UniProtKB/Swiss-Prot annotation, chains A, B:
Organism (species): Escherichia coli (strain K12)
Gene disruption phenotype: Non-essential; synthetic lethality is seen in a triple tig-dnaK-dnaJ disruption, although this depends on temperature (triple disruptions grow slowly at 20 and 34 degrees Celsius but not at all at 43 degrees) and strain background.
Protein name as catalogued: Chaperone protein DnaK
Domain of life of the organism encoding this protein: Bacteria
Protein's job: Plays an essential role in the initiation of phage lambda DNA replication, where it acts in an ATP-dependent fashion with the DnaJ protein to release lambda O and P proteins from the preprimosomal complex. DnaK is also involved in chromosomal DNA replication, possibly through an analogous interaction with the DnaA protein. Also participates actively in the response to hyperosmotic shock.
Family named by the database record: Belongs to the heat shock protein 70 family.
Subcellular location per the Swiss-Prot or TrEMBL entry: Cytoplasm; Cell inner membrane
Oligomeric form and interacting partners: In pull-down experiments interacts with CedA.
């Protein structure tokens, strides 16, 4: 029911679009911006900020501002990437009871999907404000290289936000839909290079004209879900931290508040160096010492920045080589190179990509909105409003199991088109345990574990010939479903999953309720502010009343009203809602009493 | 030759678009932004900054940062509107020799068109970078209510930027083109309400279908060229100044740095109050008393803000009434209300407009880019690329002359469609002086003077029957051209214009050369930056050369090379190009030498 909205849920920024009749349209949020910082904050006084308002106060609220949660979602606390972030992120990152990576604010433990849900709720509200009706369904994007846990956790975030997730769409695929919508873009093969704030994808995609309809087929995909702008900032921040040690004899890394100003300054500097060739990091009173206040002043050149991050850029080139090999194509087979994501605005990135492909990337693709637009198009395909568009995506990782000798044994090869299914008999009746993993490495230890899937035996029976067949389905969302039956009886077998990541149904249901309670509490937090407005309106009117009365007003009456006004003004400066309300009531009674005496 | 680019030259922000084949496209500037702040700055070391870099340093350089120049362009120094601004603007506004309003920076007097040209040059360069080739032609926008002087001055700015201005297009007309391009927006009548940073326009526009082609006809236009966001900010700034005065007993108005910080904070507060119901203005260390530093902290509710500016909003409603009357329509006849301009994002503004028209404004119009898009479309109509699009605009002000009694006599009524022509015999041979004015007021003294147009007599001659006919042409740009001729002989009569506003050919030519000199100076300034980058590259490589040598390096050689490294690092900390280049040279020679010795 209603419109299926398209939400690009980004590490750094989020963006929502719809089908406006036959044309996709990106929607401005309440603040008037076409994108929304993927940031949530909890203030000391207990307010929940989302988006720009949360971004604005981040510098002074290190611990209770959550950002880049997309780098934690669907991960385990003991993951190398997470363990590194633990020491780096200013907010607190902890292990959930099941070992998943969670955060903690003011003593409260929260799962990443709960945090992303807040961002999704704002995007949902954005669409509803625009449309003038409720929105309950969405297509939500994920990086192409997201694994099973990361996909499912993103899907759970959508549910926690009150959205039925009709499709999880791979971000480069979404960008391709956006690009190929324009008639005259048929019968070509493109490379979509997407380098954002947190993730990197490369997809090779063919757009063809079959039976008078446009088909988008992903030939190969690769990337790195933990490579993006955040890592570029970090290289520059560490340089600035090391320089200030040498220069002013002080280590800033021990100090959260200084690091906030620096983080902010480094990102601005990085961004400036995409157009200028020099930038100044000026942080007066960055810190202090025995000798007094300290100030940071350091010029950074483009050349300096480049030497700091070139290996990150090279890291994005290697998956390109693998993607072309997997697709069986050379660079000359690629008709268009498409750059997506804010971090691709770096000249070095554009230059290295141009040089690899031996051609310049297109300039007519919006690096900030293409993904959301494609998510909207995908939604329109689902509702049937978008005709003559067919899409065939793949799974980015090999699905396998740990077999005898601790080896990784592949069941479904990477770049297999989805949905897809693989069935296999695992037992003639004895119990079965299956350790499922994703990845390309030879040893199970080197791949991403999805969990242990356990089946009980089937007891011996006259004329029974148990054949326990296990089926691995990958659906259109790129998500795995494992089921089993006895082929001999047709009876389904219960599978018990152990050591898997993710939320269970009970947690999800509780978190859905928590999000509704949060909404209520937010509506409850606003009362103080709403009462101030009313207070200001009242002040304005009763002042006019006093002016009108002029000298006709007796001193005792003039004094009583002027005291009531001042009292309300004072209360308004404060934070006590009850006091404001009482002073408003007293002022109203004096305004009414004056009125009544004037009529006499 | 080349593309005719469309440039929205705004009081606050500027935006450039082109026809990308058959589709209009807004172009990002070098900073990656789809719009550019109309801000020009001159730094202490003599650099000229435009756009975001100028905006960024305004807080510390308020005297030599020029902004809102569109509020001075085409105006006289003694104009009431300018005189008010003289006391408000942080930079120095002065009278030119002819009385026009100019600005002075560091002893240099400059004409508004020279300043705006710097913004147009950036927009021009933006298009050139995208297209990969030179751009010499443009369509440039002006408020529909701009008078003759304002139009010509804007056209002069285009020339000074090296642009042949093919069309001056009224901004609401541009927005209508953008809106009506969408097939299926035909046969309707729209009201375009445009409230920006400096100017207000209302235009009533009919979009029809004649002989297969779409025609856009402006039925009426009105507005106020000195009413916009800057005035909203100003109301809030004065409130904040007064509150701090009552609170801390300090008057900030004489503190340029404090006032610049306040200006910025005030606009941010105004903008938040478009989506939130309360905002906090915080300015630590805003001033210092003998008691110590003082900090500004005050909460502002939407209710407070609305009471500070409601009369500004109401001032925009009265021209709506006049426009409908001039169009001969009622609100009922309006099919679509279109809001353009950032200042229309204010809830009070939208509500007042919705209430006036009795319908909700459309939501599917881009308030920041519609005007640039329309300018690009107009450009494509000029090149013959855009087909079946005809536009018919009007002149917004009555054109008249001062007749006996000091009365205003109308020659061309407001809302007459342009281009248009009016011819009249003024003399049977005697010398003639014609005082030309624009406006609707009955007394000449109350209208805008365009100058005195003088004609010499024609001497008595046998068979001569001199009939001096003066022709008033208003061209497609909405600009006046007065010519005269003797109908009896056909000979053209020379007109001498006195007491008029604007730049003469000689000034324009000199200003064109000055701008080219500024570009050259800019390339010069870049030299230092380029040298710094090369320095960083050189440091990087030679450091690797030292490491690779390790212990093999003799103590005297290691000392020498490390001295040279340090000396370059030191020079790069300074601002002396010569020293940097010398230290680069010495480091290079030492590197080369050790290399040679290592080869031995
Ligand atoms: N001009 C610029 N030059 C370099 N980097 C930039 C520029 N502008 C933005 N960025 C960077 O781009 C990143 C954000 O890009 P984007 O909004 O596409 O990410 P995202 O979609 O939120 O992330 P992801 O897709 O990785 O989940 C940030 O790291 C930001 O610093
Ligand atoms: N959310 C908002 N609420 C209120 N005002 C806003 C908002 N966003 C921007 N503005 C204001 O809108 C103005 C800028 O709008 P815009 O960019 O349309 O003006 P412009 O085209 O440069 O000016 P003009 O058309 O008057 O020459 C500024 O005064 C700015 O403060
Ligand atoms: Mg992204
Ligand atoms: Mg404008």
């Amino acid at each position: 029911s209603g419109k299926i909205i398209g939400i690009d849920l980004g590490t750094t920024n989020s963006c929502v679009a719809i089908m406006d009749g036959t044309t996709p349209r990106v929607l401005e949020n309440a603040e008037g911006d076409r994108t929304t910082p993927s940031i949530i904050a909890y203030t000391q006084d207990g307010e929940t900020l989302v988006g720009q308002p949360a971004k604005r106060q981040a510098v002074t609220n290190p611990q209770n501002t959550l950002f880049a949660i997309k780098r934690l979602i669907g991960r385990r606390f003991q993951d190398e990437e997470v363990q590194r972030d633990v020491s780096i992120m200013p907010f607190k990152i902890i292990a959930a009871d099941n070992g998943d990576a969670w955060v903690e604010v003011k003593g409260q433990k929260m799962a990443p999907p709960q945090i992303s849900a807040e961002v999704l709720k704002k995007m949902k509200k954005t669409a509803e404000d625009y449309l003038g009706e409720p929105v309950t369904e969405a297509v939500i994007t994920v990086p192409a290289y997201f694994n099973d846990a990361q996909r499912q956790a993103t899907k759970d975030a959508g549910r926690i936000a009150g959205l039925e997730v009709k499709r999880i769409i791979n971000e480069p695929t979404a960008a391709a839909l956006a690009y190929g919508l324009d008639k005259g873009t048929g019968n070509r093969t493109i490379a979509v290079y997407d380098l954002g704030g947190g993730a990197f994808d490369i997809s090779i995609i063919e757009i063809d004209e079959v039976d008078g309809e446009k088909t988008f087929e992903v030939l190969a995909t690769n990337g790195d879900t933990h490579l993006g702008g955040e890592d570029f900032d970090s290289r520059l921040i560490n340089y600035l931290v090391e320089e200030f040690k040498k220069d002013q004899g002080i280590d800033l890394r021990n100090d959260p508040l200084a690091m906030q100003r620096l983080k902010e300054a480094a990102e601005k500097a990085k961004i400036e160096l995409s157009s200028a060739q020099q930038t100044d990091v000026n942080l007066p009173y960055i810190t202090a010492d025995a000798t007094g206040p300290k100030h940071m002043n350091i010029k950074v050149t483009r050349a300096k920045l480049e030497s700091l991050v070139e290996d990150l850029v090279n890291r994005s080139i290697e998956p390109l080589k693998v993607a072309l090999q997997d697709a069986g194509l050379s660079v000359s087979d690629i008709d268009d190179v498409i750059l997506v994501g804010g971090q691709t605005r770096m000249p070095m990135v554009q230059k290295k990509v141009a040089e690899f492909f031996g051609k310049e990337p297109r300039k007519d693709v919006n690096p900030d909105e293409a993904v959301a637009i494609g998510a909207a198009v995908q939604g329109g395909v689902l509702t049937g409003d978008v005709k003559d568009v067919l899409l065939l995506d793949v799974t980015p990782l090999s699905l396998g199991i740990e077999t005898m000798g601790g080896v990784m044994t592949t069941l479904i090869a990477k770049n297999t088109t989805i949905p897809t299914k693989h069935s296999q008999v695992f037992s003639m009746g004895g119990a079965v345990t299956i350790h499922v993993l994703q990845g390309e490495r030879k040893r199970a230890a080197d791949n991403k574990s999805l969990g242990q899937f356990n089946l009980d035996g089937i007891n011996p029976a006259p004329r029974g010939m148990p054949q326990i067949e296990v089926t691995f389905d990958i659906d259109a969302d790129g998500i795995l479903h494992v089921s089993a039956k006895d082929k001999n009886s047709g009876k389904e077998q219960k599978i018990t999953i152990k050591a898997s990541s993710g939320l269970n149904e009970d947690e999800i249901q509780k978190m859905v309720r928590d999000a509704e309670a949060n909404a209520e509490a937010d509506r409850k937090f606003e009362e103080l502010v709403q009462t101030r407005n009313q207070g200001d309106h009242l002040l304005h009117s009763t002042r006019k009343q006093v002016e009108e009365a002029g000298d006709k007003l007796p001193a005792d009456d003039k004094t009583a009203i002027e005291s009531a006004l001042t009292a309300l003004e004072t209360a308004l400066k404060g934070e006590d809602k009850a006091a404001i309300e009482a002073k408003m009531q007293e002022l109203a009674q004096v305004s009414q009493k004056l009125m009544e005496i004037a009529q006499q």
